[PDB]
Structure 1
Amino acid sequence: KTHVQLSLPVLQVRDVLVRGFGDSVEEVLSEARQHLKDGTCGLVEVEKGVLPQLEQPYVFIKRSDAAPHGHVMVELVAELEGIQYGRSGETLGVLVPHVGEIPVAYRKVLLRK
């Protein structure tokens, strides 16, 4: 399938134990996509002072369309030193590894894979 319905657990930034997916733009996109497939991926909602508490490069999910079965359609954009790799709509938040943190909420998404 080109798109896959996912329920992403929404983590508070100060609970996140692994604060990024790697060390290159290509690696963080790669790892982000792998964790999404394996259901080991969390979402940190972006607010003032969140991003400097996580590790670059960042992986964002961004709205790719205006929502089948309540799932917002999204695609991955990485950012390193203020340069984005990818072009999409509004940030739903930054992706992080999930290692059993307790979520505050779930974000229903349709991921372009």
Structure 2
Amino acid sequence: KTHVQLSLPVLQVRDVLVRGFGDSVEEVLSEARQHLKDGTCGLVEVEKGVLPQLEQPYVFIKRSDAAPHGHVMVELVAELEGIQYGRSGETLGVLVPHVGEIPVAYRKVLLRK
């Protein structure tokens, strides 16, 4: 399927134990996609002081469309040193590995896979 319904656990930035997906734009996008498929991907909502506490390159989910079954349509965009690789809508948050942190909420998304 070109799209997959996921429920992403929303983590508090200070709880996150693994703060990025790797060391290159291509690796973080690869790893983000693998974790999303394996249900081991968390979401951190971006506010002031969140991103400096995570590791670059960042992986964002961004709104790709204006929401089937409550799931917002999203796609992946990486950022490294202020350059983004991909073009999409509003940031829903930054993806991180999930390794058993307790979530504060769930974000229903439809991921363009």
Fold similarity call, TM over 0.5: yes
SS in 2 for 1:49: coil
Cα offset, 1:98, TM superposition:
0.1
Cα offset, 1:45, TM superposition:
0.1
Cα offset, 1:8, TM superposition:
0.1
The whole-number CA distance in structure 1 between the counterparts of 2:52 and 2:30 is: 22
TM-score by length of 2: 1.00
The whole-number CA distance in structure 1 between the counterparts of 2:50 and 2:21 is: 16
Cα offset, 1:62, TM superposition:
0.1
Alpha-carbon deviations, 1:40-67, whole Å to 9, x = none? Answer: 0000000000000000000000000000
The whole-number CA distance in structure 2 between the counterparts of 1:46 and 1:34 is: 22
Q: How many percent of aligned residue pairs carry the same amino acid?
A: 100
The 5 Å alignment of 1:26-45 reads: 26-45=26-45
Unmatched segments (≥5 aa) in structure 2: none
Unmatched segments (≥5 aa) in structure 1: none
Alpha-carbon deviations, 1:7-62, whole Å to 9, x = none? Answer: 00000000000000000000000000000000000000000000000000000000
The whole-number CA distance in structure 1 between the counterparts of 2:48 and 2:87 is: 22
SS in 1 for 2:30: helix
Alpha-carbon deviations, 1:59-107, whole Å to 9, x = none? Answer: 0000000000000000000000000000000000000000000000000
The whole-number CA distance in structure 2 between the counterparts of 1:46 and 1:32 is: 17
Question: 1:60 is matched with which residue?
Answer: 60
| Cα-Cα RMSD | 0.1
